[PDB]
From a paper:
In this study, we have determined the crystal structures of bcPadR1 and bcPadR2, which are the products of gene loci BC4206 and BCE3449 of B. cereus strains ATCC 14579 and ATCC 10987, respectively. The bcPadR1 and bcPadR2 subunits contain a typical wHTH DNA-binding domain, consisting of helices α1, α2, the DNA recognition helix α3 and strands β1 and β2 (together forming the wing), and a dimerization domain, including the C-terminal helix α4. Unlike LmrR, but like the other PadR-s2 proteins with known structure, the bcPadR1 and bcPadR2 dimers have a completely closed dimer interface. The closed dimer conformation and inaccessibility of the conserved tryptophan residues of the bcPadR proteins are incompatible with a drug-binding mechanism as observed in LmrR.
Here we report the crystal structure of the BC4206 gene product from B. cereus strain ATCC 14579, a subfamily-2 PadR-like protein which we named bcPadR1. The gene encoding bcPadR1 (locus BC4206 in B. cereus ATCC 14579) is located immediately downstream from BC4207, encoding a putative membrane protein of unknown function. Transcriptome analysis revealed that BC4206 and BC4207 are co-upregulated in response to enterocin AS-48, indicating that these genes indeed form a bicistronic transcriptional unit. Overexpression results in an increased sensitivity against AS-48 (MIC value of 1.0 µg/ml compared to a MIC value of 2.5 µg/ml for the wild-type strain, p-value<0.005, >6 cultures as determined with Student's t-test) suggesting that bcPadR1 acts as a repressor of the BC4206-BC4207 transcriptional unit, when AS-48 is not present in the medium. Electrophoretic mobility shift assays further reveal that purified bcPadR1 specifically binds to the intergenic region between BC4205 and the BC4206-BC4207 operon. In vitro DNA binding of bcPadR1 was not affected by the addition of AS-48 suggesting an indirect sensing of AS-48 in the medium, although we cannot exclude the possibility that slightly altered in vitro conditions (e.g. different binding buffer) are needed to observe any effect of AS-48 addition on DNA binding. BcPadR1 was crystallized in space group P41212, with one protein molecule per asymmetric unit and a solvent content of 71%. As these interactions are crucial for the strong DNA binding affinity of RTP, it is likely that the conserved residues in bcPadR1 and bcPadR2 have a similar DNA binding role. This is corroborated by the observation of a bound sulfate anion in the bcPadR1 structure, which forms interactions with the highly conserved residues Gly25, Tyr26, Glu42 Arg71, and Lys72, likely mimicking the interactions with a phosphate moiety of the DNA backbone. The bcPadR1 dimer can be superimposed to the DNA-bound complexes of RTP and BlaI with RMSD values of 3.5 Å (for 176 common Cα atoms divided equally between both subunits) and 4.1 Å (for 153 common Cα atoms), respectively.
Author numbering:
A (entry chain A), B (entry chain A): 3 to 105
Write the structure that this text describes.
């Protein structure tokens, strides 16, 4: 699971870029897309840091059901970095995947 | 190129596991499989460390052409770790690649 953490910040940015989500909603999506080890508790410090670096930002909005939650959205800086991640990832993915099938 | 370094040790183990190679031969293969930034100079400290951790081992063998070179081969410990890398990689690769194609 040591490597899952390398790409976790990028996948969090991707998810948030596509939909405003609150903490529990985020980790649930992460779980169901294959990050089985993540929990709100384990990624919390990463969320605090991504905020301090202004990649994402939480705002208190009312939910479709009424109760007010802290939804996170991506900043312009965060989007720039998301694009960097997508580019790097497709590069490394292609490079490593082609290699490991040589025989 | 910050992420290319995460998986570089594993790809080096893969390559060495498949063929005994000397330093220049190794970096050439790395270049031609898409690690365009690597050079003998840049990966040297990583090779020294992989040796100190007993993942790979160099031995002075004679080349098909005669001159003696320092060829590297993988240790049992190195092979174990290579299998760990292959498992982790296929997991993360699948997880990230499926995610980044949601829309």
């Amino acid at each position: 699971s040591q490597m899952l953490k390398g790409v976790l910040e990028g996948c969090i940015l991707y998810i948030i870029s596509q939909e405003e989500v609150y903490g529990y909603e985020l980790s649930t999506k992460l779980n169901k897309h294959g990050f089985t080890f993540v929990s709100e508790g384990s990624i919390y410090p990463l969320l605090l840091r991504m905020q301090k670096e202004k990649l994402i930002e939480g705002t208190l909005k009312a939910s479709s059901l009424g109760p007010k939650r802290k939804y996170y959205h991506i900043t312009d800086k965060g989007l720039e970095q998301l694009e960097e991640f997508k580019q790097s990832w497709g590069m490394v993915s292609t490079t490593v995947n082609n290699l490991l099938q040589g025989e």
